[PDB]
Structures are given as structure tokens and as C-alpha cells.
Design a protein around this ligand. Structure first.
Ligand SMILES: COc1c(C(=O)CCC2CCN(Cc3ccccc3)CC2)cc(Cl)c2[nH]ccc12
Ligand SMILES: COc1c(C(=O)CCC2CCN(Cc3ccccc3)CC2)cc(Cl)c2[nH]ccc12
Ligand SMILES: *[C@@H]1O[C@H](CO)[C@@H](O)[C@H](O)[C@H]1NC(C)=O
Ligand SMILES: *[C@@H]1O[C@H](CO)[C@@H](O)[C@H](O)[C@H]1NC(C)=O
Ligand SMILES: *[C@@H]1O[C@H](CO)[C@@H](O)[C@H](O)[C@H]1NC(C)=O
Ligand SMILES: *[C@@H]1O[C@H](CO)[C@@H](O)[C@H](O)[C@H]1NC(C)=O
Lengths: 532, 532
């Protein structure tokens, strides 16, 4: 029937879900790998072995084992990001929304969640695929992957804990879509991968990785790129943190095998409790277990690959939010509070930039401070707050992304760049936090289309316009409908470097997104640190 | 007799000069030292031996030997600064303007000319003392001093060419005023020294040097300060340049005595012809022979003296012009012309910063370039022109002075700071050059009171305001007359750092003169250049 689909691995039975006074098909919790448990902890994923009978794909899967945020208990602004299903190492599943009736060979979009590579679930309310799948008539997949040590513990040289297995989980899920999505009405030749933060970085890493390039058509990157400073580590640093993880848990450290055997004996939560203890610095926007530049998933350094054009050549559509940094200041920097304006003293500012740029020498910290301090007014608590906000955002998200876009556009076949700066009317976070990291996601998934969610009429229109941009781009490689009286989102080009605002107001075109600060972050600071 | 005066060195006869429909006494070209000729070239000055009979002090003396600017033959804009008298090494004279009838014991101001320590004359039209002396009823002295190699050849250790002898010439003229000025109606206890550019640096150097402090009461510094990057050199560098001077003249370089003897045998013009060839780099706003940090005239480093409060504690009044840099770009940097808007290409902007900051390494050049470039609009010839203008002025004049004023005020007895930003109605230079280095001088000396010079009525008013500020400061240590009705020029204080604009409009008070850039020039850049 329509809800019963035979895949190369066995039969699965979906369920009929409502969506905005209508219905579509949903196949939830489809297994794409063998449970990476016991002796398979830290190991590359193995394809799911075929099953007899009918897989009950009627409900969401378990979430992967991860740090859970208990900073603000009962608070929806933080808890909406926490696992809303049981956590288990048995977590390699994907979800699929198929429009009803089932289309023939339609555009496919595959969502990859963010969460700093240490967290994230495919099952969050804001990742509910039904609205975008319905509205834009696309087949929408959300995958999952191992996070934290389970996904990114790297002991380079070992085949038992090689590193990057979380990215390989993602690849295996893509490979699965390639092989089976036709049976769901999806065109395997027109798959768009897209994701936010760590998910956006992930999408770009698959653009770079030879082993992933043939498993998708184009890419959307939201608030993340593969070259972000928090997104990868060297094999040496991966190993250092892996060894230090052992030390924290009183493991044998004589050899990888002994270290790994010991770590495989520990309950999941034991690992998580000490996860953050392996970071080299007091820091914000830094995460312990992340992709390693290993010479295998990544042939060489990310920079040289971008320089030599060694990467998938296709259309990309990508962008950032206005205040990427504020979330992370809230959690790790002095003077910030969810419940106040968070006017920042001069002392707390100094402390902040040190946390934000953990790896800089004193000269580097002075350079950053100078660049973001108004010396006619240096005791302005507000300017100090917003400056720290800009620093965290520019350095971790916006300028790394701009570096990527400029390198990619030299070789790619089309670039569309956006700047999302709408502040949602129903936000539960304080005003000072602005347009927060992650909060364009609810618009991309069409949450504003839901009456009871109490968005404004113009917010619903924005969501629809954004969904159409995303879906239309996925279908054709161009967010603009070829017809259309409506205004046009211009190509980003090496010379003119155009981008658009995304907000409730009529579209404006600008050029050179934060070029001043990004010259500092991308050219001058790196040269300063290397010289001193 | 009003014009006949007996000094400690001998009798002197002045001339009666008209001034603005009245008259005053002038004593022109009084000798204060032995001619620094023959075997006394490069030597410390010696007091003028007493003479018999009456010195005719009715005409200006010769100007010291110096480079003559022939860039723009016939052009008053550059020629007003060249020697208007025959040049001679026999040039250590001073001039005095005395109110008629002779004051009993009135305020004295002593003018020290600028000219980068390589040029200058006491006899320039724009230094004519009669207008200020007459209008404000002060005894005005203008001294002279050896410039270029003749004044500042430094071979530390040698007693034949010790260095700083031009500063000692200044001191000797000050000592003369101390000893003789009472005979002219002046109070040797209320002497203000004032000077512009090199003259302003000089003044600050007398504030610092123990040997000078007791020879004056207060100080005015215009567009120059002792700590300017062009205003001094180390004994090592001063030696290198002295030795390089000999090499450029085929001199015996084996010893100081031989080198010196060779150099004493050359015509003045031979020295001058090769003067510029000893500079370390291609540069603008750099001069070959300047004060040395010797351990004698300056006991220790200028910075350590400023830090320890090792200097004269008195009142100062100092300031800068809006476009200090423009004169120097015109002469040395590519793309600048007296007869065009001088829109500067990006390539010429790069060339300009390198010329402007010749000691910086590549990291430093990048820093400067970043700090003065609008990267949304880097090919704007205007912003590039003005940017380079600001670079030269901030680095060479404004920020050195701001460092001095901040350091000094922590110990001094009163600081008044100004920002001169009036472009004169009858300027012969192009508009792009703005408010030029040196062009507040004609206001301080009251030229706009001369109706034939065709200044506006409001420019005459401005001049009168400025002359009254300078003179009232000279008399009392405060440019303001309390009990008066006019706007008050506030003290510069460590906390509030207030300063005023000098122009034709109602007074405005501002705070933190160019803080942002001067933090860069005074704190950040030196830290960057010191690391490797
Ligand atoms: C600075 O490093 C940290 C963090 C963070 O990284 C920030 C916390 C929030 C970062 C955004 N999350 C929401 C989100 C999720 C997926 C995509 C987009 C947004 C929620 C938590 C947290 C904790 Cl608990 C830390 N403990 C020590 C150090 C540290
Ligand atoms: C011919 O001069 C130079 C320079 C200069 O720095 C010239 C700029 C001055 C030109 C006339 N001055 C007028 C003035 C005098 C007293 C107070 C205020 C303003 C001041 C700026 C540099 C180099 Cl590298 C040169 N090489 C040969 C020759 C020459
Ligand atoms: C699938 O699971 C849900 C509950 O987990 C159950 O209600 C439903 O009946 C199951 N489907 C089948 C075919 O057993
Ligand atoms: C994409 O490729 C086609 C064919 O190679 C080319 O004609 C087109 O100009 C390219 N588009 C962009 C935006 O680079
Ligand atoms: C002094 O010099 C002036 C100017 O040359 C001259 O006119 C005057 O006669 C001279 N005075 C005496 C007493 O020689
Ligand atoms: C200057 O010094 C005098 C003498 O002690 C003192 O009374 C006065 O307060 C000082 N003024 C300033 C502005 O420092």
C-alpha cells in the first residue's frame, strides 16, 4: 500500500500523520546501521543487516547518548534542544516524511542536526519534517549520528577507534537514502543535504570528503562551515583528548587497545560526566570530541583542499544569523544572565574575549580587544555586551563561513548567501540575545505555519518564503522561481559578493557580509598568531 | 633712550618699526654665541664674547645653513618657509620686539622655529613678532639654532661632535634671555617658550632636560612633542648616520677625529647635498640629523623620564592641526599632487603606508593598513587619500603628542589642549590638503590683523582670540581670564581629557582627542613591533 514499503533491507510500515488540516505519510525510526554497541563502540558503522517481517516505523527512535543541558530546568528555550526520547547507543536511525499521495521521483532533502558534535537529536519538535515535506512537496529525511566520544573519539592509526565515525554514520545514512529513497517516491539523483551549526559544518565536510560527494546533489549550510575553529582537531590533539579521557576514568594507557578496551567497559554516562574535562583551555564554543583531520575522510588539510579546489563542485546555499554568539556567552562568560540585560563591565569583557579566543597569545587578545572596543566609551556595559556577542559570532560562525563561501565560489557552480536577522515575536529568550544561534530553524521547518504556535501573520509568510527558497533551491539549484514577479535572490559572485537579508520586510541586497571584521579574523589575526 | 640698551655682552641699538598704525621697538639679529665656524663646527656653542661700541640691531641676521626647498619654484606656499636671508654658519642670533614705551617687567615669550631639525629661520615673514608683541603687550623673542648636520651630527663619546648642539644653542639663547631680558622690560621669571613642529618638540625637550628647566617658566607646544618618532635617534643610529655622511664624502672613517676633521673641511653645501642619503629607509616625515638620546642632555630614555615624572612641573598649552600629514604626502608619496585632488589608488595607498611607517615589519604594515582601510570600499581614491593623510598625521604628530599630554598631566601643574581645524580663506594649497602642518602659525602671530593680507573679518577675530589665549597663558598659566564673560577653555585632566576646537565658530569642548587611533599607535602597534 502507501504506508507499506519494501526496501533493500526489508519491509517497513509507516503511519499517516496530520499536517495543517491535511495528511502525509511518515516513516519514523528506520534503522540504517547495526547498533554501534558493546565491542562496536567507537568503531565505523556497519550497514544494518536485513530483517524478515515488517519494521514498525510508526514512532520516533531513541536519541544518541549525550550531555543533557540542565542549566534552566523547565525552560523551553533550552529544553527544546534536549533529547526528547530515551538515550541509547542504539540510535542510528532515520526518519522520512512522504507527501500523500506518493510522488514520482521528487526532490529529496536530508536534514543533519547540529549540536556542537557533542549533542543533538533528529526527533526534536523543530525538526518535525511534516510541514516542509507537505508544503513544498519534497521527500524529507532526518538522519542521526553518534556524538561526543561515541562519534568522535579519535585514536588515529587504530582501526578500533579511528575517529570521524559520526561522520561515517551520516555517510552511511546518505548511502541508504541513495539506495532506497526511490521506493519512497524520492529521486536519488536530486538529494539536498542541509543542516545547522555542527550540521552545517557536517554538510561542508561531505562536500570536501571524496567518499561522500557522490551521495548527494547539492548542499545547504546554516550557521556552520567545515572550517569553523570548533569543528575539527588534528590527529595529535584528538589523541591527546582521547588519552586524557582515559586518565579521567583511571584507564590503562599503555596502548590504544588497552585504552579502548577500558573505555568500552564504562557505562555511557560515565564518559559524558568527564567529557568536558579534556578541553585544553577554559573556553566557550569549544567541544571535546569533533572530527579529526585524518588524511582519509579528509585527504589533506581543509584549507589546502579549499585552495586546490579539491571538493564537490555544485550549487550551495548558505547563511548566518545576526547574533550567533549570544547563546554561548550566556552559558560560559561572566556577567551574562538569561534574566537581565547583561550589561558587561570592562573586567568581564576582558575575561570574555579570553574565553572566546582561547588559543590566542596576549598580543592576539589585545588585537581582538582593540578591534571591538569603542575607546570614546569603553565603560558602556551595553557596547561591551554586544561587542563580546559580535566577537563570539564573527570568530566561530560568520567569518569562518565567509572564508568558505569565498573559497568555494572560485570553483563551485553557484552560491547563494543569506543573513537571517528576524527576531521572532514569541521568543522566550531575553532581547539582548537578539537573533539567536539556531532560531532560523523553526522558520525553515515551517513551524510559523502552525496557528497554536502563536507566530505573527508576517512570520508565517517569511517561513513560507524561506521554505520555498530552500525547496526550490533543492529542486533546481536556484532559490528563485524562473517565472516570478517577485524580487530575485542574486548569485553570490567573487567580484560582487552579493547577499540578501531574510526578515519580514521586503528583500534588500547587500554586498560583502561583515567584510571588515572578517578581514581581521580571516587574514590579520591568523597571520599575527603564526608570527608570534 | 628707548632703542639703546646695554646688555651683559655689550651695547645694542634697535630700530623703531611701524605696527598696525602704531609703533614698537625691534632689536634684530643680536648675537648670543660665538660663530660656530671653523674648528667649532659640530661643537657645543660658546657664549658670545663681549664687544665694544654699539651693535646695530636694526636688521635681521643670516639664516643657518640648510637644505632649501625648490620643489615648487616661485610658489609662496612652499617658499614662505625657505631662508629669506643669506645663509651662513655664522647664524646664532636672536630677535626681540618690545612694546613702546618699554614695559617695566612684563611677560616674555620666546619662539623656537620648526623645520624638522634640518631647516628653519627666525626671520620668516610668518614669524614676525611685532603684531603679537604690540597687541598683547609682551616682550617677544625669536631665537635660532644650528640645524641639519651642523646642529645635530652625533658621534657619542666624541667631545668635538657630541650631538644635540642645536638644542644647546637654544639653551644658550634661553640663558641669554635669562640674563639680559630685564634690560628690555622683560621679567626673566615669567618666560614662556613656544614653538611649532621641531620647535614644539624642542620645547618639550627643554621641559625634560635638567639643564634647561630653570631657564623658563611655562611652555607652549604646537604640532610637535619631544617623543615624536622623527624627533630623535639613539646614539648608535646617530653614529651610523654620521659615519655614513663621511662615506658619502670619501672621508677617512678610521676614527672619530679623522672623520670629524674631514667633515670640518667641507663647504656647508657639500654636507647638505648628501644630507638625505644617510636615512635608513625610503621614508616621509623622517630627517637625517636630529637630537640623540645621549644620557647627558637627556639623562635616560624619554619614555622612562615621562614615566617617572622626571621633568619640569609647570603649566603647558599644546595642540595639533586637523591634517598634519598632508604636506608630507605631497613631497614623498605616489599619487599626490599639488594641482589635483590626488585620489589615491589602492596600490599607491599600499606604497604610502610603507613610506609612512618605514620601521614597521610586514605584520606591522598589515596592522596599519587594516586599521585605516574601509573594506566595503577599498578602491575609493578619496578615502584612500584621507586615510593616508590621517596615517601620517596620527603617527608623526597627533598621537605622539597625546601620549605626551597624558603622561605629562599626571605630574604637571595644568594642561590646556587644542585642536586647530580652521582652513584659511586665502590658502594657496589645494583643498585636499585641508588644515595644513604649520598653518596655525600665522594666526598665533596675528597676520590676519594685516588688512592687506586679505583674511576675513572672522579670521582676524580668531587670530585675536588665539593671541590672547597664548599671551594670557604666558602671563598667568591659564589661557582664560576669569571674571570674564567669554567661553572658558577647560583644563585637560587625566579623567576627563577635555580639549577645545580652535576655529571661527563658538567654542566646543570635546574629550579624548583621537583616542581610537592613538590607542593603536601608542599601545598596540609598539607591542606588535616588539614581538617576533
Ligand atoms: C560554550 O560551551 C559550552 C556549552 C555550549 O556550547 C553552549 C550551550 C548551548 C549551545 C546551543 N544549544 C542549543 C543548540 C543546539 C543545536 C543547534 C543550535 C543550537 C544549547 C546549548 C554548553 C555547556 Cl553545558 C558547557 N559546559 C562547559 C562548556 C559548555
Ligand atoms: C624637500 O623636503 C623633503 C622632505 C620633507 O619632509 C618635505 C616636507 C616639508 C616641506 C616644507 N615644510 C614646510 C614647513 C616648515 C616648517 C613648519 C611647517 C611646515 C614642511 C614639510 C622629505 C624627503 Cl625624504 C626629502 N628628500 C629630499 C627633499 C626632501
Ligand atoms: C507500532 O508501535 C506502536 C507503539 O509503539 C503500536 O501502537 C502500533 O500498534 C505498532 N504497530 C504494529 C503494526 O504493531
Ligand atoms: C554551471 O555550469 C554550466 C555548465 O558547465 C555553466 O555554463 C554555468 O555558467 C555554470 N554556472 C555557474 C553559476 O557557475
Ligand atoms: C643701522 O642699519 C640701518 C639699515 O641698514 C641703517 O639705515 C642705519 O644707518 C644704521 N645705523 C648706524 C648707526 O649705522
Ligand atoms: C598647581 O600647583 C599649585 C601649587 O601647589 C596647586 O595649588 C594647584 O592645585 C596646582 N594646579 C593644578 C591644576 O594641578
Amino acid at each position: 500500500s502507501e504506508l507499506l514499503v519494501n526496501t533493500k533491507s526489508g519491509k517497513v510500515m509507516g503511519t499517516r500523520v496530520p499536517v495543517l488540516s491535511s495528511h502525509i505519510s511518515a516513516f519514523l525510526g528506520i534503522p540504517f546501521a547495526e547498533p554501534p554497541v558493546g565491542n562496536m563502540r567507537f568503531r565505523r558503522p556497519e550497514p544494518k543487516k536485513p530483517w524478515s517481517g515488517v519494521w514498525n516505523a510508526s514512532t520516533y527512535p531513541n536519541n544518541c547518548q549525550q550531555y543533557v543541558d540542565e542549566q534552566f530546568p523547565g525552560f523551553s528555550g533550552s529544553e527544546m534542544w534536549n533529547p526528547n526520547r530515551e538515550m541509547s547507543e542504539d540510535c542510528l536511525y532515520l526518519n522520512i516524511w512522504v507527501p500523500s499521495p506518493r510522488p514520482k521521483s521528487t526532490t529529496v532533502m536530508v536534514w543533519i542536526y547540529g549540536g556542537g558534535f557533542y549533542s543533538g537529536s533528529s526527533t526534536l519538535d523543530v525538526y518535525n519534517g511534516k510541514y516542509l515535506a507537505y508544503t513544498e512537496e519534497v521527500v524529507l529525511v532526518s538522519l542521526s549520528y553518534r556524538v561526543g566520544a561515541f562519534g568522535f573519539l579519535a585514536l588515529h592509526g587504530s582501526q578500533e577507534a579511528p575517529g570521524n565515525v559520526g561522520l561515517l554514520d551520516q555517510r552511511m545514512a546518505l548511502q541508504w537514502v541513495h539506495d532506497n529513497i526511490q521506493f519512497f517516491g524520492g529521486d536519488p539523483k536530486t538529494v539536498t543535504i542541509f543542516g545547522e551549526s555542527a550540521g552545517g559544518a557536517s554538510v561542508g565536510m561531505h562536500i570536501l570528503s571524496p567518499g561522500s560527494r557522490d551521495l548527494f546533489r547539492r548542499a545547504i549550510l546554516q550557521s556552520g562551515s567545515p572550517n569553523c575553529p570548533w569543528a575539527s582537531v588534528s590527529v595529535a590533539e584528538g589523541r591527546r583528548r582521547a588519552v586524557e579521557l582515559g586518565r579521567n576514568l583511571n584507564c590503562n594507557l599503555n596502548s590504544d587497545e588497552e585504552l579502548i578496551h577500558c573505555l568500552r567497559e564504562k557505562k555511557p554516562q560515565e564518559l559524558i560526566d568527564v567529557e568536558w574535562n579534556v578541553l585544553p583551555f577554559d573556553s566557550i564554543f569549544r567541544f571535546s570530541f569533533v572530527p579529526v583531520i585524518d588524511g582519509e575522510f579528509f585527504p589533506t588539510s581543509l584549507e589546502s583542499m579549499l585552495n586546490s579546489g579539491n571538493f564537490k563542485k555544485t550549487q550551495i546555499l548558505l547563511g548566518v544569523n545576526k547574533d550567533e554568539g549570544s547563546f554561548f556567552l550566556l552559558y560560559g562568560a561572566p556577567g551574562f544572565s538569561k534574566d537581565s540585560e547583561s550589561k558587561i563591565s570592562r573586567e568581564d569583557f576582558m575575561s570574555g574575549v579570553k574565553l572566546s579566543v582561547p588559543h590566542a597569545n596576549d598580543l592576539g587578545l589585545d588585537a581582538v580587544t582593540l578591534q571591538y572596543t569603542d575607546w570614546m566609551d569603553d565603560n558602556n556595559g551595553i557596547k561591551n555586551r554586544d561587542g563580546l556577542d559580535d566577537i563570539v559570532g564573527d570568530h566561530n560562525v560568520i567569518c569562518p563561513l565567509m572564508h568558505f563561501v569565498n573559497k568555494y565560489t572560485k570553483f563551485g557552480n553557484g552560491t547563494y548567501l543569506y543573513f537571517f536577522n528576524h527576531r521572532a515575536s514569541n521568543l522566550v529568550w531575553p532581547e539582548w540575545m537578539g537573533v539567536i544561534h539556531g532560531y532560523e530553524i523553526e522558520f525553515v521547518f515551517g513551524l510559523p505555519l502552525v496557528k497554536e504556535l502563536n507566530y505573527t501573520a508576517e512570520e508565517e509568510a517569511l517561513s513560507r518564503r524561506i521554505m520555498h527558497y530552500w525547496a526550490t533551491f533543492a529542486k533546481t539549484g536556484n532559490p528563485n522561481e524562473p517565472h516570478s514577479q517577485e524580487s530575485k535572490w542574486p548569485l553570490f559572485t567573487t567580484k560582487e559578493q552579493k547577499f540578501i537579508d531574510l526578515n519580514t520586510e521586503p528583500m534588500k541586497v547587500h554586498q560583502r557580509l561583515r567584510v571588515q571584521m572578517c578581514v581581521f579574523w580571516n587574514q590579520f589575526l591568523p597571520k599575527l598568531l603564526n608570527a608570534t
